[PDB]
Scaffold this active site. Structure first.
Site, PDB file in Angstrom:
ATOM      1  N   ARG A   1      60.042  30.058  19.098  1.00 39.01           N
ATOM      2  CA  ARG A   1      60.228  29.914  20.538  1.00 39.01           C
ATOM      3  C   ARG A   1      59.036  30.417  21.355  1.00 39.01           C
ATOM      4  NH1 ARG A   1      64.743  34.380  22.614  1.00 39.01           N
ATOM      5  NH2 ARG A   1      63.898  36.216  21.507  1.00 39.01           N
TER       6      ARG A   1
ATOM      7  N   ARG B   1      57.318  35.267  29.065  1.00 36.34           N
ATOM      8  CA  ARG B   1      58.274  35.420  30.161  1.00 36.34           C
ATOM      9  C   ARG B   1      57.632  35.056  31.480  1.00 36.34           C
ATOM     10  NH1 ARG B   1      60.579  41.375  28.430  1.00 36.34           N
ATOM     11  NH2 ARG B   1      61.464  40.671  26.413  1.00 36.34           N
TER      12      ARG B   1
ATOM     13  N   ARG C   1      56.784  43.570   1.109  1.00 34.83           N
ATOM     14  CA  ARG C   1      55.713  44.240   1.810  1.00 34.83           C
ATOM     15  C   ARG C   1      56.073  45.702   2.025  1.00 34.83           C
ATOM     16  NH1 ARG C   1      54.970  41.922   7.219  1.00 34.83           N
ATOM     17  NH2 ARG C   1      55.787  43.922   8.008  1.00 34.83           N
TER      18      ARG C   1
ATOM     19  N   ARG D   1      49.586  49.520  14.863  1.00 36.70           N
ATOM     20  CA  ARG D   1      50.037  50.215  16.064  1.00 36.70           C
ATOM     21  C   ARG D   1      50.095  51.712  15.861  1.00 36.70           C
ATOM     22  NH1 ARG D   1      56.037  47.334  15.582  1.00 36.70           N
ATOM     23  NH2 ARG D   1      56.481  48.246  13.507  1.00 36.70           N
TER      24      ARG D   1
ATOM     25  N   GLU E   1      50.158  52.961  11.686  1.00 35.70           N
ATOM     26  CA  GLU E   1      50.941  52.144  10.777  1.00 35.70           C
ATOM     27  C   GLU E   1      50.066  51.063  10.147  1.00 35.70           C
ATOM     28  OE1 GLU E   1      54.756  50.824  12.327  1.00 35.70           O
ATOM     29  OE2 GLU E   1      54.493  48.848  11.402  1.00 35.70           O
TER      30      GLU E   1
ATOM     31  N   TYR F   1      65.809  41.559   5.137  1.00 42.64           N
ATOM     32  CA  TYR F   1      65.590  42.564   6.151  1.00 42.64           C
ATOM     33  C   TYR F   1      66.794  42.602   7.077  1.00 42.64           C
ATOM     34  CZ  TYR F   1      64.233  45.189  10.107  1.00 42.64           C
ATOM     35  OH  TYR F   1      64.205  46.135  11.107  1.00 42.64           O
TER      36      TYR F   1
ATOM     37  N   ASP G   1      68.165  44.725  10.568  1.00 41.16           N
ATOM     38  CA  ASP G   1      68.228  45.773  11.586  1.00 41.16           C
ATOM     39  C   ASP G   1      69.493  46.624  11.369  1.00 41.16           C
ATOM     40  OD1 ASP G   1      65.834  45.348  13.196  1.00 41.16           O
ATOM     41  OD2 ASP G   1      66.817  43.588  14.068  1.00 41.16           O
TER      42      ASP G   1
HETATM   43  C1  LIG Z   1      59.805  50.262   8.422  1.00 43.20           C
HETATM   44  C2  LIG Z   1      61.202  50.017   8.932  1.00 43.20           C
HETATM   45  C3  LIG Z   1      61.460  50.078  10.298  1.00 43.20           C
HETATM   46  C4  LIG Z   1      62.730  49.788  10.805  1.00 43.20           C
HETATM   47  N1  LIG Z   1      62.931  49.823  12.182  1.00 43.20           N
HETATM   48  C5  LIG Z   1      64.108  49.483  12.632  1.00 43.20           C
HETATM   49  C6  LIG Z   1      64.306  49.447  14.052  1.00 43.20           C
HETATM   50  O1  LIG Z   1      63.487  49.805  14.893  1.00 43.20           O
HETATM   51  N2  LIG Z   1      65.564  49.016  14.432  1.00 43.20           N
HETATM   52  C7  LIG Z   1      66.599  48.662  13.575  1.00 43.20           C
HETATM   53  O2  LIG Z   1      67.691  48.328  14.050  1.00 43.20           O
HETATM   54  N3  LIG Z   1      66.402  48.716  12.237  1.00 43.20           N
HETATM   55  C8  LIG Z   1      65.219  49.099  11.798  1.00 43.20           C
HETATM   56  N4  LIG Z   1      65.019  49.103  10.441  1.00 43.20           N
HETATM   57  C9  LIG Z   1      66.118  48.813   9.508  1.00 43.20           C
HETATM   58  C10 LIG Z   1      66.963  50.040   9.178  1.00 43.20           C
HETATM   59  O3  LIG Z   1      66.287  50.949   8.307  1.00 43.20           O
HETATM   60  C11 LIG Z   1      68.322  49.656   8.594  1.00 43.20           C
HETATM   61  O4  LIG Z   1      69.237  50.729   8.808  1.00 43.20           O
HETATM   62  C12 LIG Z   1      68.366  49.344   7.098  1.00 43.20           C
HETATM   63  O5  LIG Z   1      67.620  48.162   6.821  1.00 43.20           O
HETATM   64  C13 LIG Z   1      69.814  49.210   6.681  1.00 43.20           C
HETATM   65  O6  LIG Z   1      69.972  48.503   5.442  1.00 43.20           O
HETATM   66  P1  LIG Z   1      70.538  49.429   4.216  1.00 43.20           P
HETATM   67  O7  LIG Z   1      71.566  50.402   4.649  1.00 43.20           O
HETATM   68  O8  LIG Z   1      70.972  48.568   3.105  1.00 43.20           O
HETATM   69  O9  LIG Z   1      69.145  50.064   3.787  1.00 43.20           O
HETATM   70  P2  LIG Z   1      68.428  51.392   3.311  1.00 43.20           P
HETATM   71  O10 LIG Z   1      68.063  52.169   4.555  1.00 43.20           O
HETATM   72  O11 LIG Z   1      67.227  50.916   2.616  1.00 43.20           O
HETATM   73  O12 LIG Z   1      69.403  52.341   2.442  1.00 43.20           O
HETATM   74  C14 LIG Z   1      69.510  52.080   1.029  1.00 43.20           C
HETATM   75  C15 LIG Z   1      69.686  53.411   0.347  1.00 43.20           C
HETATM   76  O13 LIG Z   1      69.981  53.209  -1.055  1.00 43.20           O
HETATM   77  C16 LIG Z   1      69.317  54.213  -1.788  1.00 43.20           C
HETATM   78  N5  LIG Z   1      69.204  53.791  -3.176  1.00 43.20           N
HETATM   79  C17 LIG Z   1      68.444  52.754  -3.675  1.00 43.20           C
HETATM   80  N6  LIG Z   1      68.554  52.597  -4.966  1.00 43.20           N
HETATM   81  C18 LIG Z   1      69.426  53.586  -5.361  1.00 43.20           C
HETATM   82  C19 LIG Z   1      69.937  53.976  -6.615  1.00 43.20           C
HETATM   83  N7  LIG Z   1      69.605  53.373  -7.765  1.00 43.20           N
HETATM   84  N8  LIG Z   1      70.781  55.027  -6.660  1.00 43.20           N
HETATM   85  C20 LIG Z   1      71.091  55.651  -5.519  1.00 43.20           C
HETATM   86  N9  LIG Z   1      70.670  55.387  -4.277  1.00 43.20           N
HETATM   87  C21 LIG Z   1      69.841  54.339  -4.267  1.00 43.20           C
HETATM   88  C22 LIG Z   1      67.995  54.405  -1.059  1.00 43.20           C
HETATM   89  O14 LIG Z   1      67.460  55.679  -1.381  1.00 43.20           O
HETATM   90  C23 LIG Z   1      68.455  54.331   0.406  1.00 43.20           C
HETATM   91  O15 LIG Z   1      68.792  55.606   0.953  1.00 43.20           O
HETATM   92  C24 LIG Z   1      63.757  49.440   9.910  1.00 43.20           C
HETATM   93  C25 LIG Z   1      63.505  49.402   8.547  1.00 43.20           C
HETATM   94  C26 LIG Z   1      62.241  49.686   8.047  1.00 43.20           C
HETATM   95  C27 LIG Z   1      62.015  49.638   6.557  1.00 43.20           C
HETATM   96  C1  LIG Z   2      59.135  46.591  11.638  1.00 42.20           C
HETATM   97  C2  LIG Z   2      60.428  45.995  12.108  1.00 42.20           C
HETATM   98  O1  LIG Z   2      61.510  46.549  11.920  1.00 42.20           O
HETATM   99  N1  LIG Z   2      60.328  44.844  12.785  1.00 42.20           N
HETATM  100  C3  LIG Z   2      61.477  44.165  13.361  1.00 42.20           C
HETATM  101  C4  LIG Z   2      61.500  44.455  14.863  1.00 42.20           C
HETATM  102  O2  LIG Z   2      60.164  44.410  15.401  1.00 42.20           O
HETATM  103  P1  LIG Z   2      59.263  43.290  16.145  1.00 42.20           P
HETATM  104  O3  LIG Z   2      59.426  41.869  15.759  1.00 42.20           O
HETATM  105  O4  LIG Z   2      59.501  43.410  17.635  1.00 42.20           O
HETATM  106  O5  LIG Z   2      57.765  43.749  15.869  1.00 42.20           O
HETATM  107  P2  LIG Z   2      56.545  43.026  15.145  1.00 42.20           P
HETATM  108  O6  LIG Z   2      55.296  43.519  15.772  1.00 42.20           O
HETATM  109  O7  LIG Z   2      56.595  43.534  13.711  1.00 42.20           O
HETATM  110  O8  LIG Z   2      56.808  41.444  15.006  1.00 42.20           O
HETATM  111  C5  LIG Z   2      56.625  40.415  15.998  1.00 42.20           C
HETATM  112  C6  LIG Z   2      55.714  39.327  15.480  1.00 42.20           C
HETATM  113  O9  LIG Z   2      55.031  38.743  16.610  1.00 42.20           O
HETATM  114  C7  LIG Z   2      53.633  38.763  16.410  1.00 42.20           C
HETATM  115  N2  LIG Z   2      53.029  39.808  17.262  1.00 42.20           N
HETATM  116  C8  LIG Z   2      53.725  40.924  17.675  1.00 42.20           C
HETATM  117  C9  LIG Z   2      53.171  41.863  18.466  1.00 42.20           C
HETATM  118  C10 LIG Z   2      51.815  41.712  18.901  1.00 42.20           C
HETATM  119  O10 LIG Z   2      51.200  42.498  19.641  1.00 42.20           O
HETATM  120  N3  LIG Z   2      51.186  40.580  18.444  1.00 42.20           N
HETATM  121  C11 LIG Z   2      51.718  39.607  17.632  1.00 42.20           C
HETATM  122  O11 LIG Z   2      51.062  38.648  17.250  1.00 42.20           O
HETATM  123  C12 LIG Z   2      53.393  38.966  14.918  1.00 42.20           C
HETATM  124  O12 LIG Z   2      53.265  37.708  14.260  1.00 42.20           O
HETATM  125  C13 LIG Z   2      54.625  39.776  14.496  1.00 42.20           C
HETATM  126  O13 LIG Z   2      54.969  39.476  13.150  1.00 42.20           O
HETATM  127  O14 LIG Z   2      62.478  43.692  15.561  1.00 42.20           O
HETATM  128  C14 LIG Z   2      62.410  42.270  15.349  1.00 42.20           C
HETATM  129  C15 LIG Z   2      63.488  41.638  16.209  1.00 42.20           C
HETATM  130  O15 LIG Z   2      64.719  42.351  16.145  1.00 42.20           O
HETATM  131  C16 LIG Z   2      62.522  41.940  13.862  1.00 42.20           C
HETATM  132  O16 LIG Z   2      63.811  42.309  13.382  1.00 42.20           O
HETATM  133  C17 LIG Z   2      61.426  42.663  13.083  1.00 42.20           C
HETATM  134  O17 LIG Z   2      61.571  42.419  11.685  1.00 42.20           O
END
Ligand SMILES: Cc1cc2nc3c(=O)[nH]c(=O)nc-3n(C[C@H](O)[C@H](O)[C@H](O)COP(=O)(O)OP(=O)(O)OC[C@H]3O[C@@H](n4cnc5c(N)ncnc54)[C@H](O)[C@@H]3O)c2cc1C
Ligand SMILES: CC(=O)N[C@H]1[C@@H](OP(=O)(O)OP(=O)(O)OC[C@H]2O[C@@H](n3ccc(=O)[nH]c3=O)[C@H](O)[C@@H]2O)O[C@H](CO)[C@H](O)[C@@H]1O
Ligand SMILES: Cc1cc2nc3c(=O)[nH]c(=O)nc-3n(C[C@H](O)[C@H](O)[C@H](O)COP(=O)(O)OP(=O)(O)OC[C@H]3O[C@@H](n4cnc5c(N)ncnc54)[C@H](O)[C@@H]3O)c2cc1C
Ligand SMILES: CC(=O)N[C@H]1[C@@H](OP(=O)(O)OP(=O)(O)OC[C@H]2O[C@@H](n3ccc(=O)[nH]c3=O)[C@H](O)[C@@H]2O)O[C@H](CO)[C@H](O)[C@@H]1O
Ligand code: NA
Ligand code: NA
Lengths: 386, 386
Positions: A175, A179, A256, A287, A312, A363, A365
């Site tokens: 999309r 804005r 990744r 960032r 990062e 992935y 949230d």
């Molecule tokens: C870099 C990053 C940024 C993020 N930023 C945001 C954000 O801004 N906003 C948002 O809404 N979400 C964000 N998320 C997503 C957020 O972390 C979610 O809560 C998550 O993806 C939830 O999925 P989960 O509970 O399955 O994952 P996980 O958080 O990955 O939990 C899985 C758990 O299982 C455990 N585990 C794995 N294997 C085993 C095993 N064999 N035995 C026991 N334990 C085990 C791990 O240790 C871990 O604690 C982000 C995620 C990442 C990676």
């Molecule tokens: C790290 C992480 O959890 N990312 C999540 C979060 O971040 P965002 O999608 O808001 O952050 P982001 O910077 O990782 O991704 C936006 C995308 O737009 C592009 N881009 C972004 C910014 C900029 O300055 N320039 C540019 O080119 C780029 O291709 C990037 O992949 O929320 C999104 C919407 O809910 C998605 O769920 C993403 O997976």
């Protein structure tokens, strides 16, 4: 029995499933967690020198338009009125972001009205029709034009994906990223905020129930034969890695990862905002986060002369790296479909359910993880536990 | 009796006093209001062609750090999560506003860190010491420097006060108008929002009580002898003009007024933000309001192709003009002090209390009017009504 349900992993998915079984069904739940703490990647902690709340697995911003999820999480923590805003550093200037009347004014050099900006974008993006785009670069240009694309999208995207945008799917942009007003709220969701007492306290509250037992520093694969022998009928909800569960019999799924370089600086304020994107190729990081600005309501608990920042870096996940984002090459999609058939069979033969980010190669949230757990609870576990 | 208390005028001050007497003391209250509607200047209405909520006596933004006032007003209306933000048009560019890292980047041409911006402002404002400033212009320059002053303060101020800033008090500026971060929230208060169903509904709810009678289109001075003869012991709270009450026996108090030029345009969006300041002398108006952006939550009740804007002009109030802001020349302060002695005498001889913006010759925000009414109620009227 000592437990009626085993949950592997204590991320938002695991916690939600465990808390619902415990509070709604009155079941005993055993949570097995490999790390030294609860919460998965959403877990946060105090930085020792400053006391500032920081993240070691990525900054976490909570936002949702799902009212059921919002009402659910508010049982366990209150949220601040924090609204995420981002700025984009390009060629020595901090631009308002995402693309809107603000950035457009700063970048093209004078004020465009909503209707003028719409006309500008039509002109700029006339070069390529999005129906003719064959990759990410072309698709981006077909929507917003070359100047905007090359300034704010090209290098950032290249740093994040470690790939030339000419080699990414046109389907990665779906999309108009522009804005036609001055609204620079980063998220568009109805509900948004940060946990008032931090993520660690929130996530700990979810697991805090008379029916829930937590074992940290425990790998499921090291204890599973013993645990299930105690109560063979207890189902397992597994949120660990999908491919590892089946001994990589179909290959290694590609992820990744991210590197975080976290520094304490001897200034009260590094960049004056929580997140600054670095859109130019000359900066290796995508960032910088400055954690104190996520909680301005805590300002007199924060130091006046020190601050914690974090840079990062994005790259392919190698062995020993934290897997964060599925790469989803067609090769990945193939072995995933094979693993889905193994998982489905394992569910009906072994009462092992698969969920969460790692368990499903997707992935999620936080609110989507919670919604997904609520659904598995409602549609699968209520029946499996009677 | 038919009433125990008479309140003259139905602005926030009058309404608050009337509602407290009615609900807390169980008294019958008669409200006398000269205009055809309740609410004083905070009153709002639908524009007929578009249905958009607009103001005819100035845009009203509600904000307070006074929790007692916040809890009080929420008995009568809910508030949106609206946060006021303003942009400043200077020389063809829309600047982030108030002055902060955003404006500084846009204006000086590249990104300054918090500490760099502090150093820039030290350099720029080195020219004059604020302790040596003899007027507004010098005081402004002594704080932020000539370039910032001449771009964003000089002409705007001159348009508002109809005076050269060289001829205004140095005491009109009392603190550094510069933020060393990217925070462009316009107000600094704990609580902020707009009434969910508009001001008219809010203010009408305050007067909606079994103990409250409202008479619109009624001038106090035309009905007072009759009303008080019905119940001589009933106190009066007067929020009308102070000088007019005493037949201008000490002179006419000086006020500034505003002219509003309100237009319906055939576009869905004129400026993409609620308020744009026009800081250059070439524009006669000080700012433009676009009313639809105050309530983005009402977007599918708003027209997609029309919008209401309003231009705001400032000038001295002549006879027939709405008096809005006290001018407060030393001549004004003199006759005010004389009117205060008359009012105080009138209170003890006639049980007439004086309050509100007009009754006290003092500009009051809504929350300050409410706080002032709550105080008069607590400290004066509870005793006067037993
Ligand atoms: C870099 C990053 C940024 C993020 N930023 C945001 C954000 O801004 N906003 C948002 O809404 N979400 C964000 N998320 C997503 C957020 O972390 C979610 O809560 C998550 O993806 C939830 O999925 P989960 O509970 O399955 O994952 P996980 O958080 O990955 O939990 C899985 C758990 O299982 C455990 N585990 C794995 N294997 C085993 C095993 N064999 N035995 C026991 N334990 C085990 C791990 O240790 C871990 O604690 C982000 C995620 C990442 C990676
Ligand atoms: C790290 C992480 O959890 N990312 C999540 C979060 O971040 P965002 O999608 O808001 O952050 P982001 O910077 O990782 O991704 C936006 C995308 O737009 C592009 N881009 C972004 C910014 C900029 O300055 N320039 C540019 O080119 C780029 O291709 C990037 O992949 O929320 C999104 C919407 O809910 C998605 O769920 C993403 O997976
Ligand atoms: C241009 C403008 C913009 C404003 N913007 C904001 C803002 O953004 N935020 C904010 O918090 N506040 C704002 N305010 C202030 C806001 O209007 C307050 O609610 C107001 O100042 C409250 O004081 P009051 O109740 O005494 O005043 P008023 O609103 O002036 O009410 C007095 C009432 O008395 C009536 N009256 C006068 N004489 C007589 C008489 N002889 N007989 C009968 N009735 C009489 C008048 O008709 C009027 O209804 C603004 C004010 C103005 C003028
Ligand atoms: C109309 C009205 O109700 N105003 C009130 C409201 O608005 P504000 O004070 O926020 O608005 P404003 O524009 O009327 O006043 C700010 C002052 O700063 C100067 N200035 C402002 C903007 C700009 O672009 N350039 C510039 O030079 C100018 O001298 C002006 O007088 O809230 C304030 C704080 O609560 C005061 O209560 C004001 O009385
Ligand atoms: Na195109
Ligand atoms: Na100075």
């Amino acid at each position: 029995s000592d437990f009626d349900l085993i949950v592997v992993g204590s991320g938002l998915f695991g916690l939600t499933v465990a808390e619902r079984a415990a509070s709604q069904l009155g079941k005993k739940v055993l949570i097995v967690e490999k790390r030294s703490h609860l919460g998965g990647n959403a877990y946060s902690e105090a930085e020792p020198e400053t006391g500032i709340e920081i993240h070691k697995y990525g900054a976490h911003l909570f936002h949702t338009s799902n009212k059921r999820v919002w009402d659910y999480v508010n049982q366990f923590t209150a949220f601040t009125g924090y609204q995420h805003r981002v700025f984009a550093m390009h060629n020595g200037t901090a631009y308002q972001f995402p693309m809107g009347l603000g950035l457009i004014n700063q970048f093209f050099g004078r004020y465009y009205t909503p209707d003028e900006a719409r006309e500008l974008i039509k002109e700029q993006s006339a070069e390529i029709d999005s129906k003719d785009a064959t990759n990410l670069e072309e698709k981006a240009i077909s929507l917003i034009g070359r100047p905007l694309y090359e300034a704010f999208i090209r290098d950032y995207t290249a740093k994040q994906w470690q790939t030339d945008p000419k080699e990414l799917p046109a389907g990665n942009i779906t999309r108009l990223p522009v804005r036609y007003n001055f609204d620079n709220r980063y998220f568009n969701d109805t509900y948004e905020g940060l946990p008032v007492d931090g993520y660690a306290q929130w996530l700990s509250n979810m697991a805090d129930h008379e029916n829930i037992e937590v074992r940290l520093d425990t790998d499921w694969f090291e204890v599973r034969e013993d645990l299930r022998a105690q109560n063979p009928e207890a189902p397992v909800v597994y949120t660990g890695p999908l491919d590892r569960y089946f001994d990589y019999s179909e290959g290694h799924l590609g992820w990744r990862t991210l590197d975080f370089e976290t520094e304490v600086l001897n200034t009260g304020d590094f960049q004056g905002t929580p997140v600054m994107n670095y859109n130019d190729a000359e900066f290796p990081y995508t960032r910088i986060h400055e954690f104190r600005h996520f909680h301005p309501e805590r300002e007199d608990r924060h130091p006046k002369d020190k601050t914690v920042i974090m840079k990062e870096y994005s790259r392919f996940a190698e062995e020993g790296d934290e897997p964060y984002y599925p790469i989803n090459t067609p090769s990945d999609r193939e072995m995933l479909f094979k693993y889905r058939e193994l998982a489905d069979a394992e569910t009906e033969s072994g009462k092992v359910y698969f969920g969460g980010r790692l368990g499903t190669y997707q992935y999620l949230d936080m609110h989507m993880a919670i919604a997904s757990a609520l659904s598995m609870f409602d549609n699968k576990l209520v029946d499996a536990l009677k």
